[PDB]
Enzyme design. Structure first.
Site, PDB file in Angstrom:
ATOM      1  N   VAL E  45      41.126  29.713 -40.849  1.00  0.00           N
ATOM      2  CA  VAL E  45      41.085  28.272 -40.563  1.00  0.00           C
ATOM      3  C   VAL E  45      41.254  27.421 -41.853  1.00  0.00           C
ATOM      4  CG1 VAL E  45      39.439  29.137 -38.908  1.00  0.00           C
ATOM      5  CG2 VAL E  45      38.573  27.675 -40.716  1.00  0.00           C
ATOM      6  N   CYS E  46      42.310  26.605 -41.941  1.00  0.00           N
ATOM      7  CA  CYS E  46      42.341  25.566 -42.981  1.00  0.00           C
ATOM      8  C   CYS E  46      41.187  24.593 -42.765  1.00  0.00           C
ATOM      9  CB  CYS E  46      43.668  24.811 -42.936  1.00  0.00           C
ATOM     10  SG  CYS E  46      43.736  23.374 -44.019  1.00  0.00           S
ATOM     11  N   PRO E  47      40.296  24.435 -43.772  1.00  0.00           N
ATOM     12  CA  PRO E  47      39.108  23.662 -43.388  1.00  0.00           C
ATOM     13  C   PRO E  47      39.370  22.170 -43.347  1.00  0.00           C
ATOM     14  CG  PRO E  47      39.003  24.257 -45.695  1.00  0.00           C
ATOM     15  CD  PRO E  47      40.276  24.857 -45.181  1.00  0.00           C
TER      16      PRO E  47
END
Ligand SMILES: [Cl-]
Ligand SMILES: [Cl-]
Ligand SMILES: [Cl-]
Ligand SMILES: [Cl-]
Ligand SMILES: [Cl-]
Ligand SMILES: [Cl-]
Ligand SMILES: [Cl-]
Ligand SMILES: [Cl-]
Ligand SMILES: [Cl-]
Ligand SMILES: [Cl-]
Ligand SMILES: [Cl-]
Ligand SMILES: [Cl-]
Ligand SMILES: [Cl-]
Ligand SMILES: [Cl-]
Lengths: 161, 161, 161, 160, 161, 162, 161, 162, 161, 160
Positions: E45-47
């Site tokens: 997940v790209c935060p």
């Protein structure tokens, strides 16, 4: 039968003559009370019964008797019902909302699989004691003039033990 | 309350027109029934109530309604009361004895600390469903003409849903 | 929270475009569903939220999303509310009555001391899995346009894992 | 057998000589008591038994002995029975009504499927202690002169 | 849901701007708080979500709102994450570690079969009462600007019942 | 009380007329039975009650009534008593020994804090039903003539109910 | 201790040489295994112990011994740790993540108030039986060359009972 | 084994040399005591064991040891037994009756299905502590002289520890 | 006591004449058996008792009586004791080791606060029924001659009711 | 495991050169302790382990470290082994007997189905806290030299 038992503590919102009031068992102490239960505001069933008690509301007040109708609807719904039905409109007594069903269950009067009260009337004396009970199915009507006789008879035996 | 429930099975002795008979729920099947409970034979509370139902008994029978009075006394006691009270003498319906209180407890109608039934009337339809309930305190009399009215309304809604 | 759980079976009466219908979990199967809970019809809150969702209903339907509003009021009350409020009048989705509180307790969403549902929104995917939840106190309004964004995002990840 | 146990507290209404009175265990204290149980007033069984005790009643009183008959009927039914059976009419002791069956159950004496008491007699001394018990089926009669014999022996052992 | 309940006592380590600090419930008293939960550091997940809250952070602080992100990672791991992702790097709020899962379970937010927290956001007022809740599945993003709107509305209503 | 209940199974040793026998509930079936309990052999009370019954046994036997005395002493003790008491010596019915107290407890007739049976008499009909019960304290004697009246009466109702 | 018991079933994610793999007890059957627990990645403790086992790893593999390191961190965290520390980078065996703590509790090795594993080493034979246990506090280092001696002795007694 | 436990409180009636007495645990305090249990008076089994103990009773008394025989019979039966058996007749020590079984159960010595005590002997010191136990079946005889050997040894060890 | 009860199953290691054997209850079936318990090997107390029984073992063997000494020591310790005490060396019967206490507890013969068996002797007949029991405090010696007298009595009574 | 927990109280008999003594937790307070458990005296398996510790005992005493070996054998049995065996005879530290198994169970180190302790070594600091644990099956030997390494390292960490 809850006959001859003391009513339980309760705290509900109600609609009475264009305003919202709170009712508790303390409002009933030292008074005669009629608790008049019915299933649902705005049902297609014509509310003849609620309005008959309304017609007799004058005498009941001279006998020191308060009348409380009770359904599991909220007091907001009562105000709306009171505004749209001519028969309901002539009600000047308190209309109690019981959405938790606590008041209804106090009187052992809840249809648990519908979330509505049965068609029950309870007469309660000033010490909080239930002196009369009438319950009918949806086809058998409660006669408000019969209620008055029972209330008047109850006051009599209070005076002449 | 027991409104709209099926009566429970029972087996009791009764006195009826000079005889001792046994009554069970099987006797009620397919008929309208009135169960009329009271606390005690020979109290000298005048049995104004028992006699009112008696006056209307012919009328009730033409509507196909059976009447059973019930107290926790024995049937022996009923026969003696019937011989000694002018008013009770005109009863032609069955007077049920319930010394075990089983019939009384079936209708949830026992004053447990006195061992006597409360002043309750139950109207039961031919399928055994309780359609009307009336309970009063020891001073407030049950009106047989109102009973009759309720029975006719109960019979009406059965025929015309 | 109930995030990522399957909704439970339910059976309620509802009002939708002038009629009474039954809704069950089977109606949601194979569809996206929004369950939009609120405390009470005819409440002092002008029902801006219910109406905000109404404005977006055409957009939502094009996404295959059904909308169900839910309170513990009856469906009868819904019909009356729909008739008296110009804002409610524009609701064309189903308004579910939940007087037993069963539907509300399924979503763990009942204020037990008020007998009313909390202000909660649930997005449920075609397999019955809860994918988004929002609950606010009575002063914080739910924004239907934020609801739409979440639903489209929910639909995207379904299509592109 | 409840022999040698203390009677339990009780509170009942009774008919005694044209009046309704309340009877409790406190009424038995410091006194000898006979509790005479029977199934039902107005039963077709002729109550020779209740009446034999009546015949012996001044004698019992001269011994400081109280007599209580007990059935699960009410005191109302007793008063009525008292007006209708010439035999019962000669009862001058208290006829206790026990519609709750509590008094009957204190003495372990209830026919539970009939709601009536068994044909039992209990002799109770001034300390509330049961000193004699007799129970019979419905055809076998209790003899009041034997009751008297037993009470007198009990008073003797009380003294010695 | 946990709406309108008081947060439970807790005691955790956190990383905030190059230091390890301890956080307990006592740090939230008299303040507005956002508890922002996520499943795992260093996820694929790209935060985007955590970093979006960072951009709005100055504004949040001037409204008196403190922010705590919470994961079941240790504070050591947070510190490493903060050094390797430019996006996490712009976080100036406290990053709480919850390896025992107690903080997470207080908010009823644990996936027990993964040992990770769900994607939940809680807005908590100065008396410790939860006023807003938002929960989503792994693809549906939380919008920090809509968080702000909710927070500002909550503040209005505190001041104006 | 135990009025109108069926007696329970039991199996005990007894002394009877110069012999040891075993008695069971099987022996009572189809007979009228009197179970006559007393506290202890060789006690300070002269055994007038047991002797009194002995005086009536032939009457009782012609009416088809069996008599069983019961205490929690052993049958060995009964045999010895029978040899030393002039009163007991004329006993021709079975003297049951009940050291476990089971027969006594069947009739709910044990003084648990003494381990002795109470002074109780039970009349039992051929179907095993208890038709009369008599229990008295230690100074109040049980009358065997009155016992007979009860037994004769019990047999009459069996032949003529109502 | 767990000495001489069979290891319990487990199913965990792990990092091994640049990839994510799943490890279960089925992977340990028929092989010798070393389970090497430590508290936390990215700890202020320089991980001398973990890198020491790596130096002996080629040797261990000639003896048929697999190595699994275990912490309550996720496998994601292991991969990041593996990338930033030169000492950790030389690990070529599987690094098991145990965020639920289930694997750790199987070996009774959880510090329950910290949510981290203790420094424990377990030697497990091909039937799953634990043949050696070594546990130390933080200052006391586990010596990988003594671990080797123990594995060779364990292998000897298996072959020459 | 109850070996090395303190005896439990008790209260029983007993027959001792023509008189009825009460025996309680207070009578054992400060004395050596032998509790000698047996199943039943007037039994088919020759009461040789009790008589043999009686022969040694003046020697036991010289050593400050009291003897108590125990059965679940009453004390009345013991007086009777004492008058009819020449063997029992020479007993000058207390014969305790235990119809409730509490004393027998204290020594864990009851045969529950018979309501009789087993053949057990216990030696109890002045502090109430059980120092020796012997139990045998109905055919295996207790040797009163071995009992005596043990009491002297038990007394030796008490006064000269180690 | 355990008088007239059947011994319970057991499985213990024992030293007998230079060899280690296993003794179970199947060894005692159809035989007369003496179980001779004592507190501890290599104790200050003179092993007079084990030896006087050894002096009679030949005569005991003629009567079909087996002897087993039992303590909670191991069979290894019995072997060593047999080598150091001139007295124990004369013993030719089985010396059972009972380190678990199971055999000892079977016979209700454990000093729980010491983990040692009490000084007890049991005579067991071929059907496994205990026919004689003797237990003494530590200063009071058991006389093996009396034991033989009882066994002879026991065999006689078996043969002659 | 029991790592980093405080040892529980105990009271045991022991053989320590020549004589019998009683050891309790108080004898460990303020000192470094090694508890060295093994299954059984006089077992065929040669006490190489106990002897190795003995060789290092003078170095251990110099570090302020006490040694207690423990098995479920009695102290009487330990003494006899101490005389029968050349290996064991070199032992100068305390040999504790634990017949009730309480000391052993305190260290969760009992093989319940055999009644013998497992092969386990526990290093305990002066505050009674367990700082190191090693347990092995019967073929794998506990190396005494590593036990010292762990103890010296424990003590280093204790000061820093
Ligand atoms: Cl009711
Ligand atoms: Cl009802
Ligand atoms: Cl939720
Ligand atoms: Cl509800
Ligand atoms: Cl009784
Ligand atoms: Cl009743
Ligand atoms: Cl929640
Ligand atoms: Cl009875
Ligand atoms: Cl008993
Ligand atoms: Cl472990
Ligand atoms: Cl451990
Ligand atoms: Cl955890
Ligand atoms: Cl014992
Ligand atoms: Cl034993």
């Amino acid at each position: 039968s809850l006959i001859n038992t003391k009513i339980k503590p309760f705290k509900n919102q109600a609609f009475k003559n264009g305003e919202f009031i709170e009712v508790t068992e303390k409002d009933t102490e030292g008074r005669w009370s009629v608790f008049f239960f019915y299933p649902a505001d705005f049902a297609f069933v014509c509310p003849t019964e609620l309005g008959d008690v309304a017609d007799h509301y004058e005498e009941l007040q001279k006998l020191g008797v308060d009348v409380y109708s009770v359904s599991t609807d909220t007091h907001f719904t009562h105000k709306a019902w009171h505004s749209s039905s001519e028969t309901i409109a002539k009600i000047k007594y308190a209309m109690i909302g019981d959405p938790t069903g606590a008041l209804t269950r106090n009187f052992d009067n809840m249809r648990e699989d519908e979330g509505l009260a049965d068609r029950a009337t309870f007469v309660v004396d000033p010490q909080g004691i239930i002196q009369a009970i009438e319950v009918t199915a949806e086809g058998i009507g409660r006669d408000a003039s019969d209620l008055l006789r029972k209330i008047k008879a109850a006051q009599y035996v209070a005076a002449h033990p």
